[PDB]
Design a protein around this ligand. Structure first.
Ligand code: MTX
Ligand code: MTX
Ligand code: CA
Ligand code: CL
Ligand code: CL
Lengths: 159, 159
């Protein structure tokens, strides 16, 4: 089962290359709880933004360029990223844009962090008709001393 | 001697009601570099924002209210925060606003991070007289894959 996880600003703006203008350790904890122990698919700008392999996860990099690092699996296509994963029950695709675009039609679940931030951007999360998907979980949180902005956690299941 | 270390958005903004909306790991590695093995003074609201005691430095909390944690030294005056530091060549003030205001006139050195972020803030760094300080180091950097905004590092020494 392929799942997408993403953190979206207002209008569905996503990162392109530079780090997003927010501080949300609570989203990073939600990211780790829901990816640990699973294989992760990412694109190359995602890679470098992390800057190291995620521990306790199988790191798969889908790119046309080439394997700088030995600690991660370098794949050139959709299908080879799929296979690199094995027979697991849940595959996490963690971004960026292009990567989302390519896995979504294949995807069964959406983990989304909806953040109350107005950011300028070219890239947006692919359009998904929330009518072809069921909200299974929704929880809002207010900004605080550690979290820069309000946020919403959401789980959607492809109906 | 005493030194102040601060991050400042445009117009000298140093604090919002919630977490600052930037992600600047560069700034934290500059902060640790410059504060390691020195005593740090802070106010309470900065302590609660860090979450724990900073590693490798002596933690001083400047507060009229009494202590919640055994791992740090709590002080109720500027002169007991000094005395508690001992015989160290340089004492680090770390914020927030009112702490910097009390310590300003005693400070000999400023380690400043200028961030190109336009934010409404709560608290501001005190107004200093720029003709009274000499820049002895400047370094600019653009936003990147890990840092949300451009910034510049400066050290100023009192003329
Ligand atoms: C830039 N990047 C991509 C990233 C960031 N937040 C997202 N948030 C969501 N919800 N979804 C994504 N796909 C997402 N991806 C990062 C950067 C750091 C960490 C990381 O350091 N995560 C630690 C948890 C935090 C910490 O160790 O400092 C983890 O083990 O997963 C993860 C992703
Ligand atoms: C809210 N806070 C106050 C803070 C933040 N940025 C600053 N930036 C500067 N230049 N000056 C300050 N006084 C400043 N103060 C923080 C929060 C986290 C850390 C912190 O975790 N720092 C690690 C470095 C980062 C990593 O190891 O997570 C450390 O050893 O100093 C320090 C200060
Ligand atoms: Ca100079
Ligand atoms: Cl990417
Ligand atoms: Cl404070």
């Amino acid at each position: 089962m392929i799942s997408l996880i993403a953190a979206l600003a207002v209008d569905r703006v996503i990162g392109m290359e530079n780090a997003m203008p927010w501080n949300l350790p609570a989203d990073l904890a939600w990211f780790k709880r829901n990816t640990l122990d699973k294989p992760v698919i990412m694109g190359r700008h995602t890679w470098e933004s992390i800057g190291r392999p995620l521990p306790g996860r199988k790191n798969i990099i889908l790119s046309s360029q080439p394997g700088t690092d030995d600690r991660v699996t370098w794949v050139k296509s959709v299908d080879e990223a799929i296979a690199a994963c094995g027979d697991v029950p849940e595959i996490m695709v963690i971004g960026g844009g292009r990567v989302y675009e390519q896995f979504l039609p294949k995807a069964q679940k959406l983990y989304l962090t909806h953040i109350d931030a107005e950011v300028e951007g070219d890239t947006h999360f692919p359009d998904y008709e929330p009518d072809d998907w069921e909200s299974v979980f929704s929880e809002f949180h207010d900004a605080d001393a550690q979290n820069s902005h309000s946020y919403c956690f959401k789980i959607l299941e492809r109906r």
